[PDB]
Amino acid sequence: NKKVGVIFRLIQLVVLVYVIGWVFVYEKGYQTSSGLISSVSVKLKGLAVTQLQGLGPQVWDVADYVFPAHGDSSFVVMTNFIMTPQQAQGHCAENPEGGICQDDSGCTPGKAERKAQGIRTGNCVPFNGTVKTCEIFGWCPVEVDDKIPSPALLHEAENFTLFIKNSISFPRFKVNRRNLVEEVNGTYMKKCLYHKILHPLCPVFSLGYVVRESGQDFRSLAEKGGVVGITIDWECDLDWHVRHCKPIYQFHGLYGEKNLSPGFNFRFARHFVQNGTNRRHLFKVFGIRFDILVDGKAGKFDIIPTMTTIGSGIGIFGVATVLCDLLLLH
Amino acid sequence: NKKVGVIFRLIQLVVLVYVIGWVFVYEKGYQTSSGLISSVSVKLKGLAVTQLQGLGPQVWDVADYVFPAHGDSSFVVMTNFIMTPQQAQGHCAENPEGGICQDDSGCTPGKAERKAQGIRTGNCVPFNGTVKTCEIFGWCPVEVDDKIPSPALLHEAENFTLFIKNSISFPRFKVNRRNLVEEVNGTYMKKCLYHKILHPLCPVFSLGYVVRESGQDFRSLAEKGGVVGITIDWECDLDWHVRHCKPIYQFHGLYGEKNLSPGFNFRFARHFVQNGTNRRHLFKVFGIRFDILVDGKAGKFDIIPTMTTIGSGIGIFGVATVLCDLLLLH
Amino acid sequence: NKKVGVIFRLIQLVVLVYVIGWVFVYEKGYQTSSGLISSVSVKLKGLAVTQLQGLGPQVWDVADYVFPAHGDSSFVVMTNFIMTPQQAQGHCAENPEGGICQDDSGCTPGKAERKAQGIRTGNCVPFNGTVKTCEIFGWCPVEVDDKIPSPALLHEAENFTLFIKNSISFPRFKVNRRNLVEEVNGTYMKKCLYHKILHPLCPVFSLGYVVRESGQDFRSLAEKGGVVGITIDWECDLDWHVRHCKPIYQFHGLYGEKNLSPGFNFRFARHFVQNGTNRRHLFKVFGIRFDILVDGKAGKFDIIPTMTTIGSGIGIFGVATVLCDLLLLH
Ligand SMILES: Nc1ncnc2c1ncn2[C@@H]1O[C@H](COP(=O)(O)OP(=O)(O)OP(=O)(O)O)[C@@H](O)[C@H]1O
Ligand SMILES: Nc1ncnc2c1ncn2[C@@H]1O[C@H](COP(=O)(O)OP(=O)(O)OP(=O)(O)O)[C@@H](O)[C@H]1O
Ligand SMILES: Nc1ncnc2c1ncn2[C@@H]1O[C@H](COP(=O)(O)OP(=O)(O)OP(=O)(O)O)[C@@H](O)[C@H]1O
Ligand SMILES: *[C@@H]1O[C@H](CO)[C@@H](O)[C@H](O)[C@H]1NC(C)=O
Ligand SMILES: *[C@@H]1O[C@H](CO)[C@@H](O)[C@H](O)[C@H]1NC(C)=O
Ligand SMILES: *[C@@H]1O[C@H](CO)[C@@H](O)[C@H](O)[C@H]1NC(C)=O
Ligand SMILES: *[C@@H]1O[C@H](CO)[C@@H](O)[C@H](O)[C@H]1NC(C)=O
Ligand SMILES: *[C@@H]1O[C@H](CO)[C@@H](O)[C@H](O)[C@H]1NC(C)=O
Ligand SMILES: *[C@@H]1O[C@H](CO)[C@@H](O)[C@H](O)[C@H]1NC(C)=O
Ligand SMILES: *[C@@H]1O[C@H](CO)[C@@H](O)[C@H](O)[C@H]1NC(C)=O
Ligand SMILES: *[C@@H]1O[C@H](CO)[C@@H](O)[C@H](O)[C@H]1NC(C)=O
Ligand SMILES: *[C@@H]1O[C@H](CO)[C@@H](O)[C@H](O)[C@H]1NC(C)=O
Ligand SMILES: [Ca+2]
Ligand SMILES: [Mg+2]
Ligand SMILES: [Mg+2]
Ligand SMILES: [Mg+2]
Numbered sequence: 002n003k004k005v006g007v008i009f010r011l012i013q014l015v016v017l018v019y020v021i022g023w024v025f026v027y028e029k030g031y032q033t034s035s036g037l038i039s040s041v042s043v044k045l046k047g048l049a050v051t052q053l054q055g056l057g058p059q060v061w062d063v064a065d066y067v068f069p070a071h072g073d074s075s076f077v078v079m080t081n082f083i084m085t086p087q088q089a090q091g092h093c094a095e096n097p098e099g100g101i102c103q104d105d106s107g108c109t110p111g112k113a114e115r116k117a118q119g120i121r122t123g124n125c126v127p128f129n130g131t132v133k134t135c136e137i138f139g140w141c142p143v144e145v146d147d148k149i150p151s152p153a154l155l156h157e158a159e160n161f162t163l164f165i166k167n168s169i170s171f172p173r174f175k176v177n178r179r180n181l182v183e184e185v186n187g188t189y190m191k192k193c194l195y196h197k198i199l200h201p202l203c204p205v206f207s208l209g210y211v212v213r214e215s216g217q218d219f220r221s222l223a224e225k226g227g228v229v230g231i232t233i234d235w236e237c238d239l240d241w242h243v244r245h246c247k248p249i250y251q252f253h254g255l256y257g258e259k260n261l262s263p264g265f266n267f268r269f270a271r272h273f274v275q276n277g278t279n280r281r282h283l284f285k286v287f288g289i290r291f292d293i294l295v296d297g298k299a300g301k302f303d304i305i306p307t308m309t310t311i312g313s314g315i316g317i318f319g320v321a322t323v324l325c326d327l328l329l330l331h
Numbered sequence: 332n333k334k335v336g337v338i339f340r341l342i343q344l345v346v347l348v349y350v351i352g353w354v355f356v357y358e359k360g361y362q363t364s365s366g367l368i369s370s371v372s373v374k375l376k377g378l379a380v381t382q383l384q385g386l387g388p389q390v391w392d393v394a395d396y397v398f399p400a401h402g403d404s405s406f407v408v409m410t411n412f413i414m415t416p417q418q419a420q421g422h423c424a425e426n427p428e429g430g431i432c433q434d435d436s437g438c439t440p441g442k443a444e445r446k447a448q449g450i451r452t453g454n455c456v457p458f459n460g461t462v463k464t465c466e467i468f469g470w471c472p473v474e475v476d477d478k479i480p481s482p483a484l485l486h487e488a489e490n491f492t493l494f495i496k497n498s499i500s501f502p503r504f505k506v507n508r509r510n511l512v513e514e515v516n517g518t519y520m521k522k523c524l525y526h527k528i529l530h531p532l533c534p535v536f537s538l539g540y541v542v543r544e545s546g547q548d549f550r551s552l553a554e555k556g557g558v559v560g561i562t563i564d565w566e567c568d569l570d571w572h573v574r575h576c577k578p579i580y581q582f583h584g585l586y587g588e589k590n591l592s593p594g595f596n597f598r599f600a601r602h603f604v605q606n607g608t609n610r611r612h613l614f615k616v617f618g619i620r621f622d623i624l625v626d627g628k629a630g631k632f633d634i635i636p637t638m639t640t641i642g643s644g645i646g647i648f649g650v651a652t653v654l655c656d657l658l659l660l661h
Numbered sequence: 662n663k664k665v666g667v668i669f670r671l672i673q674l675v676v677l678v679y680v681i682g683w684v685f686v687y688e689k690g691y692q693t694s695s696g697l698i699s700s701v702s703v704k705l706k707g708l709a710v711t712q713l714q715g716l717g718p719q720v721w722d723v724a725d726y727v728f729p730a731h732g733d734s735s736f737v738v739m740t741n742f743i744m745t746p747q748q749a750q751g752h753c754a755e756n757p758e759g760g761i762c763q764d765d766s767g768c769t770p771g772k773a774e775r776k777a778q779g780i781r782t783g784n785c786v787p788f789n790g791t792v793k794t795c796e797i798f799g800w801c802p803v804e805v806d807d808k809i810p811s812p813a814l815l816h817e818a819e820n821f822t823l824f825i826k827n828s829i830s831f832p833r834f835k836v837n838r839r840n841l842v843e844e845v846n847g848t849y850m851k852k853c854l855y856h857k858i859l860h861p862l863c864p865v866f867s868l869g870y871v872v873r874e875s876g877q878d879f880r881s882l883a884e885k886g887g888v889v890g891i892t893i894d895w896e897c898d899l900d901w902h903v904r905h906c907k908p909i910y911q912f913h914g915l916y917g918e919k920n921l922s923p924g925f926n927f928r929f930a931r932h933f934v935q936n937g938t939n940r941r942h943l944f945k946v947f948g949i950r951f952d953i954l955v956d957g958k959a960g961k962f963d964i965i966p967t968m969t970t971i972g973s974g975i976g977i978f979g980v981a982t983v984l985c986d987l988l989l990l991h
Binding site for chain 2: 700702706707717722723724730826829832839841846933935957965979980
C-alpha cells in the first residue's frame with residue numbers, strides 16, 4: 002500500500018499549495034478590504050459655431066453645451082439641437098402630431114388625454130396651407146422636429162477635450178488619492194490626450210476617442226443623441242507605496258435598437274423678458290449622455306484577516322485529509 | 332441495527348439532494364454573476380394651466396415643471412408653487428417670522444445669525460398696517476409663504492405620462508439591454524399606460540398611478556411636496572434567450588411625520604433684465620421628486636463556478652457523513 | 662489519559678462557546694439584513710453680500726449660491742466667483758494665455774486644437790497696451806481669471822445653516838424612517854447646531870463646522886475651491902423599537918495636491934436679452950462640493966437564518982472535534 006500513500010501525500014501537498022497560494026497570494030486573504038468615497042468633477046474646453054439659415058452665427062462654449070454646469074458625474078454634451086425662438090403664450094394652432102381637424106365641429110374644448118400640447122378652444126385653424134390643426138392656448142411657435150439636420154450642428158465637439166477630476170478616500174485606512182497621480186505633471190497636462198496604451202494617466206479625454214472606445218460611431222450619436230458609460234477603477238494594494246495606486250478608465254457603450262426611440266434627447270427653455278413681454282427659447286437638444294461611476298477597493302495588511310485565513314486553511318486541510326481517509330476506507 | 336443504517340442512508344440522500352439542488356440548482360451556483368452599468372433617461376409629457384389671482388393664465392410644459400431638464404435619475408416634478416415676481420435689491424421690510432420690532436432702538440445693524448433674510452440697516456419700518464419688521468437690504472418683494480393653496484395649482488399633473496428610458500449593459504458578458512423590450516413595438520407605446528398586472532412592460536408611467544402604487548395619495552403630496560422612490564430590477568438568466576430579460580418596476584413611498592417637515596420643497600429664481608434693471612422671479616416649488624435606482628444581476632454558465640460548487644458540495648457531503656457517523660457511534 | 666480527555670473537552674466547549682456567541686450575539690447571525698432606498702433633500706438658509714469695485718452691492722440668497730436648486734445629494738455652495746458682465750458675440754481679442762502674436766502673419770485662421778477660445782479671424786489685435794493677442798469670434802469680454810481675490814467674496818458662508826432631509830425605507834421589512842428622530846422636535850429645530858457630542862441629532866449643519874470636521878480649513882476651500890464628503894449611516898436593529906434607529910453622520914475631506922489643479926471650480930452663464938441684443942453674464946464659481954452618500958442596513962429576527970447559523974455552528978464544532986481527535990492521535 003505505497004501507491005495509496007503517495008496519492009495521499011500528493012493530495013496533501015496540493016491542498017497545502019492551494020490554501021497557501023490561492024487564499025493568500027491570489028485572493029489577498031491576509032489583507033482587509035474597505036470602500037472609498039468618490040466625488041467626480043468634469044470640465045469641458047471646446048467651442049463650436051453653428052450657423053442657421055436666416056440667423057447669425059451662434060457661439061457655444063462650456064457653459065452652453067454643458068447643462069450640468071455646476072459639475073456632476075452624469076452630464077450631457079450638446080451635439081445637435083432644434084431651436085424654436087420667440088415663444089409667447091396665446092391662442093394659436095397646435096402641432097399636427099396631436100391631431101388634424103377638417104372643421105370646427107370636430108374640435109373638442111379641453112385638454113388632450115395623452116401628449117397634450119395645450120388647452121383646445123374648440124376651433125379648427127389652419128396650421129399651414131394644406132392641413133389644419135386644433136387651436137390651443139400656449140406657446141404659439143410650435144416645435145416642429147420632423148426635420149433633423151443630418152450633419153451635426155456641433156460636429157466640432159468630436160475632438161474636444163474633457164478633463165475628469167476624481168478624488169477618492171478610504172475612511173478605514175485614512176488615505177486620500179486623486180486621479181492626478183505623481184506621474185502627472187503640469188507640463189504633461191498642458192499637452193496630452195488620453196490613450197488606452199500610450200497615455201493612460203493623462204486625465205484629458207477626447208470625446209470622439211471616448212465614444213469610439215465604447216464601440217459607437219460619433220456621427221450617428223451626434224445626429225440624434227447617445228449614451229456613453231465611463232467607469233473608473235481604483236483597485237490597489239496599500240502594502241506597496243501610494244505611488245503604485247493609479248486609476249483605470251473603461252468606456253462602455255449604452256445603446257438600444259435604432260428603430261425604436263434611437264438616441265437621447267430632451268427639451269429645455271431659457272426664460273427672458275423682451276419689450277415687457279415674457280418670452281422664451283425652446284431647444285430640443287440631441288446630446289451624448291456621459292455617466293461616470295467610480296468603484297474601488299484597497300487592501301492593507303492586518304493580523305485578524307491573516308489569522309482567520311490561516312484557520313480556514315487549517316480547517317480545509319483537515320477536511321481534505323478526512324475525505325481522503327474516507328475514500329481510502331471505501 | 333437496521334434503524335441505524337436506515338437513518339444513515341436517509342441523511343445521505345438528504346444531504347445529496349441538498350448539495351445537488353438548493354445549493355446547485357436553486358442558488359444557480361453554476362453561473363457567474365456581475366454588475367451592470369445603467370443610465371436613466373426620463374421624459375415628461377402633459378400641460379397644466381395655473382391662473383393666479385390678479386394674473387393671467389400661466390402655461391407650464393415639460394421644460395417648466397421638470398427642473399432637471401437635461402435628464403437625471405433624480406428629478407422633481409412641480410405640483411404646487413408660490414410665485415413672488417419682480418424682485419429687486421433694495422432697502423425694505425423683512426418677513427415677520429424673522430423678527431418684530433416696536434421701535435428703531437430695538438433693531439440692531441448687521442446680519443441675523445440664524446435664518447438671515449438680509450443686512451439689517453438698523454431702522455424699524457412697518458411691514459404692514461398692524462406690525463412692523465426690521466429693515467433689511469435685499470430683494471424687496473420678500474417671500475410670504477404662510478398661506479399655501481389647498482387646491483394644487485398643477486393638479487393636472489396627476490395623470491401625466493412619464494417615459495423612462497433605461498439602458499443597462501453587463502461588461503463581463505458584453506450584453507446590452509434596454510427597457511424597450513422586444514414586446515415594446517413602438518405602436519404599443521402610443522396607447523399603453525403602465526399597470527402592475529395588465530401592462531408590466533409599457534414604458535409610460537402615470538404619475539398618479541405611481542403615487543398610488545407607492546402607497547400615498549397624490550393630492551396630499553401635491554399640496555406640500557412629496558418623495559417617491561422607483562426601483563428597476565434587471566435580474567435575468569443569460570442561459571436563456573435575451574428576450575426573456577425584462578425589467579421589473581417597483582414603487583416605494585418615502586415619507587415621514589406630517590407634523591414636522593411635511594413634504595418636499597425648494598427655492599429657485601429666474602434672473603432677467605427688464606427696463607435696464609436686474610430683476611428676478613422667486614418660486615417656492617412644492618413638488619414630488621422621483622428617485623430611480625437600477626440594480627440588476629446576470630448569470631451565465633461557467634465551468635469554474637460549477638467546479639467550485641461541486642467541490643463545496645462534496646466537502647459538505649463528507650462533513651455530513653462524518654457527523655452522522657459520530658452521532659450514530661454515540 | 663484523563664488529562665488529555667479533559668483538554669479535548671475544554672477545547673470543544675471553547676469552540677462551542679465561540680460558535681454560539683460570536684455568530685449569534687456579536688455578528689447577529691440569527692437575523693437577516695436588507696438594503697434601503699434613500700432620498701436626500703438639502704436646504705440652505707444664509708445671505709452673503711459681495712461688493713465689487715465699480716459695481717453695486719450684490720445680494721446672494723439661497724437660490725443664488727445653490728446651483729442645484731431643485732435639490733440633490735451632490736450640490737455646490739458658491740464661496741468665491743469671478744464675474745465678467747455684458748458678454749456679447751463679436752470680433753475681439755482673446756486671452757493671452759492661449760497665444761501671443763506680434764504680427765498679423767503669425768495668426769492662423771481657424772480654431773485652436775486645444776483649449777479653443779473662438780474662431781481666429783487671422784488678424785493680430787492688441788489685447789492691451791503691452792501685448793497683442795489673436796482676434797477671435799465669440800464673446801467679446803474674454804474672461805480674465807488670472808487674479809483670484811485672496812479674501813473669499815462669500816466668506817459669510819462659513820457659518821451658514823445647512824438642513825439635510827433624508828428619508829430611508831427598507832422594502833423587505835416595510836419600515837420607513839427619517840432623519841428627524843422622535844427626539845427631534847420643532848422647538849429643537851428652531852435653535853440647534855450639529856455637534857458630534859453635544860447635538861448629534863440636530864439636522865442643522867454649519868458649513869464651517871462640516872469643513873473643519875473633515876480636516877480642512879474653510880478659508881482656502883472658499884478661496885480656491887474644495888470638496889467635502891458627507892456620509893449618513895443607518896445601521897440599526899429591528900429587534901428593538903424604531904426609536905433606537907438613529908442616523909450617524911460622518912464627514913470626509915476630499916483634497917489633492919495644491920500645486921497641480923487645486924480646489925474645485927466650474928463656469929456657468931446667465932442668458933438675458935437687453936436692448937434687443939442677446940447678452941450673458943459669465944461666472945467662474947469657486948465653491949465647495951458637498952457629496953451625500955447614505956448606506957445602512959436593518960436586521961430583524963427570522964427562523965431560517967437562525968437554523969442556518971445553528972447548522973453551521975454544529976458543523977464547525979464537529980470539524981473542530983475531528984481535528985482535535987486527529988491531533989491527539991498524532
Ligand atoms: N477640459 C480640459 N481640457 C484641457 N485642459 C484642461 C481641461 N480642464 C482643465 N484643464 C487644464 O488643467 C489645468 C488645471 O485645471 P483647473 O481645474 O485648475 O482649471 P483652471 O485653471 O481653473 O481653468 P482655466 O484654465 O480655464 O483657468 C489648467 O491649466 C487647464 O489648462
Ligand atoms: N412622457 C411620454 N409620454 C408618452 N409618450 C412618450 C413620452 N416620451 C416619449 N414618448 C413617445 O415615445 C416615442 C419615442 O420616444 P423619443 O425619445 O423618440 O421621443 P421623440 O420622438 O424624440 O420626442 P417627441 O415625441 O416630442 O418628438 C415618441 O414617439 C413619443 O411619442
Ligand atoms: N437650512 C436651514 N437652516 C435652518 N433651519 C432650517 C433650514 N431648512 C429648514 N429649516 C427649518 O426647518 C423647518 C421645517 O422645514 P421645511 O422643509 O418645512 O422648511 P419650510 O418651512 O418649507 O421653509 P421656510 O422655513 O423657509 O418657510 C422650518 O421651520 C425651517 O425653519
Ligand atoms: C403642412 O404641414 C404638414 C404637417 O405634417 C406637412 O405634412 C405638409 O407638407 C405642410 N405643407 C406645406 C405646404 O408646407
Ligand atoms: C479633430 O481634431 C482636430 C484637432 O487636431 C480638429 O481641428 C478637428 O476639427 C477635429 N474634428 C472634428 C470633426 O471636430
Ligand atoms: C511629468 O510627467 C510626464 C509623464 O509622462 C513626463 O512626460 C514629464 O517629463 C514629467 N515632467 C517633469 C518635469 O518631471
Ligand atoms: C400684517 O402681517 C402680519 C404678519 O404675521 C399678519 O399677522 C397680520 O394679519 C397682517 N395684517 C394685515 C392687516 O394684513
Ligand atoms: C386623469 O386623466 C385624464 C385623462 O384621461 C385627464 O383628463 C384628467 O385631467 C386626469 N385627472 C387629473 C386630476 O388631472
Ligand atoms: C407589439 O407588441 C405589443 C405588446 O403588447 C402588442 O400589443 C402589439 O400588437 C404588437 N404589434 C405588432 C405589430 O406586432
Ligand atoms: C497686458 O496683459 C498682459 C497679460 O499677461 C499683462 O502681463 C500685462 O501686464 C498687461 N499690461 C498692462 C499695461 O495692463
Ligand atoms: C460665524 O457665525 C456668526 C454667527 O454667530 C456670524 O455672525 C459670523 O459672521 C460667522 N463668521 C463668518 C466668517 O461668517
Ligand atoms: C426637543 O428635543 C430636545 C432634544 O433632546 C429636548 O431637549 C426637548 O425637551 C424636546 N422638546 C420637546 C417639546 O419635546
Ligand atoms: Ca431678460
Ligand atoms: Mg416629434
Ligand atoms: Mg416660511
Ligand atoms: Mg485660467
